[PDB]
């Protein structure tokens, strides 16, 4: 009825897709073998909902997802793991070799000879649909596949499919932390090619979640499991309106109209405010008046970017659980009363609201708690200009000496592409300054 395809691209993509499907299988009742013990006892209903999953005759439900890494090490864990009998083999191990942290291999050399199968499986999964709306692409700036393959794939999809909400759930580089010396070179060149074809690009950062998980969940020694089990909740809060019922169901075509004023500022953020554990699950009411402020309170955002250094061009709050709308209106009013939370003159309304009745589930073997009401705030700020500015500064410090460029020209690249991808980010850093200046009456 209302389908959505999920394109996991890279190690981060699969490490998040596993956490997402571990949740989507527990919510609806599906098992790792694609089976359903509960609802069949009754003999009716559509619990294993057809938005993300397909169906067969023997009860097997199959997800609508494509996986690709250009490296076997990750997908073979799925093939040999617990969720091996769920996925159709549309998991693309083409990993005779990896992208070596360079955007040039994922884009031209190692990208070609691999992309056509991805397009073919996307096409085979779209023909099954009856009015799909979406393409959720999971990827990672800084890497090669996530930087390059994402760009090439979006460039092909925007031609072959067109007016479909090509959404992105991306990991932004931490300003201090990183795991690659040539990460900015990849990030800038990813943005330059995706700034046209994408429609909305959500953004996280692994440093912010670390700070959160030590401040709120009280984890001093985490892993990536504890981060992706929290990202899966954001994505479920996004997709709940399609899978489940609810008062104000909010779909994916509504995000890009409310949060994206101009096609070049489609870089919003995310945050999950109730990140408390069972020790702290008690002693707190967890009402909407606390959560809507937590979502705006710094030290709870998922990208280290202080919005007090900027403004708010829009905001979307997607509730889920025993939430009454009047509490949401009171909360939004309280937020509008505060002086620190700055709003542009060209958006007095600001907010979109979404409400669902299904609470978040509790992935066992996890760190979160069972809450009766949870929230996700998407947000577009003028603050993220600081981060693009930082990355451009790094790019300049490195490219002034033409460091690491030989690895890129060695795989089909040209210095003009570097300067071209630079200037189209200066233009964006100037746009963010242009729009944030109030209108001259």
């Amino acid at each position: 009825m209302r389908e959505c395809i999920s394109i996991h691209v890279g190690q981060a993509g699969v490490q998040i897709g596993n956490a997402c499907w571990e949740l989507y299988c527990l919510e609806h009742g599906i098992q790792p073998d694609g089976q359903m013990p509960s609802d069949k006892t009754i003999g009716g209903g559509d619990d294993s909902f057809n938005t993300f999953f397909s169906e067969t005759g023997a009860g097997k439900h199959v997800p609508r997802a494509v996986f690709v890494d250009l490296e076997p090490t990750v997908i073979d864990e799925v093939r040999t793991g617990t969720y091996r009998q769920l996925f159709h083999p549309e998991q693309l191990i083409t990993g005779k070799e990896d992208a070596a942290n360079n955007y040039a291999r994922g884009h031209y050399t190692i990208g070609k000879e691999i992309i056509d199968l991805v397009l073919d499986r996307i096409r085979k999964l779209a023909d099954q649909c009856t009015g799909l709306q979406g393409f959720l692409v999971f990827h990672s700036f800084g890497g090669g596949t996530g930087s390059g393959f994402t760009s090439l794939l979006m460039e092909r999809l925007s031609v072959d499919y067109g007016k479909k909400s090509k959404l992105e759930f991306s990991i932004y580089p931490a300003p201090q932390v990183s795991t690659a010396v040539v990460e900015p070179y990849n990030s800038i060149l990813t943005t330059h090619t995706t700034l046209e074809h994408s429609d909305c690009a959500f953004m996280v950062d692994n440093e912010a979640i670390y700070d959160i998980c030590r401040r709120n969940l009280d984890i001093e020694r985490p892993t990536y499991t504890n981060l992706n089990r929290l990202i899966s909740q954001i994505v479920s809060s996004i997709t709940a309106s399609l899978r489940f019922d609810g008062a104000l169901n909010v779909d994916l075509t509504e995000f890009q109209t409310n949060l994206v004023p101009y096609p070049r500022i489609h870089f919003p953020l995310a945050t999950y405010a109730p990140v408390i554990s069972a020790e702290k699950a008690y002693h707190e009411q967890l009402s909407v008046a606390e959560i809507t402020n937590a979502c705006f309170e710094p030290a709870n955002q998922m990208v280290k970017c202080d919005p007090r250094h900027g403004k708010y061009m829009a905001c979307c709050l997607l509730y889920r659980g025993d939430v009454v709308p009047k509490d949401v209106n009171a909360a939004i009013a309280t937020i509008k009363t505060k002086r620190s939370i700055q709003f542009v003159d060209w958006c007095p309304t600001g907010f979109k609201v979404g409400i669902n009745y299904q609470p978040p589930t509790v992935v066992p073997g996890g760190d979160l708690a069972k809450v009766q009401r949870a929230v996700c705030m998407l947000s577009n700020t003028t603050a993220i200009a600081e981060a693009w500015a930082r990355l451009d500064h790094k790019f300049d410090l490195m490219y002034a000496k033409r460091a690491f460029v030989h690895w890129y020209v060695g795989e089909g690249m040209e210095e003009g592409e570097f300067s071209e991808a630079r200037e189209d980010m200066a233009a964006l850093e100037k746009d963010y300054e242009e729009v944030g200046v109030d209108s001259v009456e």
């Binding site: 884009h107 031209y108 050399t109 070609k112 033409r402 460029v405 030989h406 020209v409 060695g410 795989e411 089909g412 690249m413 040209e414 210095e415 003009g416 592409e417 300067s419 071209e420 200037e423 233009a427």
Partner: protein, 346 residues
């Protein structure tokens, strides 16, 4: 104290491009040049040391062929006679004004004949019995960081393209082992040697156009003047060697847009690597003149390595960049400009 003096030259519309009513993206004012897209949103500026506005034959400051010669090459002549060395670079995408700018046409030539004929005239004027003059030429190329010579008539085999090698004599510097060095005193010899050479050059057909250069080509001259007459007798102790090096380079070939694998990409990768190393040499050597301690990477490329003694110390380099003002060549054009910009930089 070295000086570089990069430049640009904008070609006029060819008649074919005229009859299409193709648009004009490149504009000027004073000396600065700018590229205004058909979108007219993003505007750029690329101020240079020298600029040759050849967009028409009406505009003030129309830099004709005589002008381009007399403004760049003639200082190189006056320095080659002073006992210095000189190098010239000819960068330009296909269809930009390169061969017209180096060589020219029979009715309005380029730089090379105006170099060689000024040379021979000043020589036969200065050719006394006391001091003599000896010109020794060579003409070689580069291909996937391999050396090849363009002064041999290959017998038709698979190839006799001897993959020659570069060596480093300590005093005289780098050189090529096994290089033909023909002698010339009348310009019509150089034309015959070059017409036997460029046929042996490397090139192949691809999308944008067929006759696209895919190898750098150096044309070297050695002027030795035997002036030294010692008092006690007919002895000639000191003899001044002057090396001139005019190189026609290739294009960058952004291969993300042009599908190419196998050998063509192996050529484009190497051209791009050499262009980058050349940009690095020039951006370090312009700062050399400003007393800043910087090391020049001559060794990462054969082209910049063999010319360590022709792009350093006591010499006068030069770079001329030919770009089109058409609108179907805006991606290409800008690249060239930015290249030249990173060479001048101050």
């Amino acid at each position: 104290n070295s000086q570089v003096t990069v430049a640009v030259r904008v070609r006029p519309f060819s008649k074919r491009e005229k009859t299409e009513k193709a648009s004009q993206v490149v504009f000027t004012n004073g000396e600065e040049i700018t590229v205004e897209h058909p979108d007219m949103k993003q505007v750029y500026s690329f101020i240079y040391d020298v600029s040759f506005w050849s967009f028409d034959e009406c505009h003030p400051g129309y830099a004709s062929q005589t002008t381009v010669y007399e403004t760049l090459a003639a200082p190189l002549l006056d320095r080659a006679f002073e006992g210095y060395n000189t190098c010239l670079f000819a960068y330009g995408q296909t269809g930009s004004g390169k061969s017209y700018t180096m060589m020219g046409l029979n009715e309005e030539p380029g730089i090379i004949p105006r170099f060689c004929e000024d040379l021979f005239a000043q020589i036969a004027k200065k050719q006394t019995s006391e001091v003599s003059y000896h010109l020794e030429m060579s003409f070689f190329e580069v291909y996937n960081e391999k050396i090849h010579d363009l002064l041999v008539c290959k017998g038709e085999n698979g190839q006799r393209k001897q993959p020659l090698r570069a060596r480093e004599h300590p005093v005289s510097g780098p050189y090529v082992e096994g290089l033909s060095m023909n002698v010339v005193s009348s310009y019509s010899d150089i034309q015959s040697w070059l017409e036997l050479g460029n046929k042996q050059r490397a090139t192949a057909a691809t999308g944008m156009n067929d006759k696209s250069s895919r190898s750098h080509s150096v044309f070297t001259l050695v002027m030795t003047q035997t002036k030294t007459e010692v008092v006690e007798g007919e002895e000639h102790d000191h003899r001044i060697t002057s090396r001139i090096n005019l190189v026609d380079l290739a294009g960058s070939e952004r291969c993300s847009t042009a599908h190419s694998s196998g050998q063509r990409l192996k050529e484009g990768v190497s051209i791009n690597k050499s262009l980058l190393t050349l940009g690095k040499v020039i951006s370090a050597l312009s700062e050399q003149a400003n007393g800043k301690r910087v090391f020049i990477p001559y060794r990462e490329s054969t082209l910049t390595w063999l010319l360590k003694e022709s792009l350093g110390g006591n010499s006068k380099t030069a770079m001329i960049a030919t770009v089109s003002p058409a609108a179907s060549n805006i991606e290409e054009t800008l690249s060239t400009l930015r290249y030249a910009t990173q060479a001048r930089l101050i």
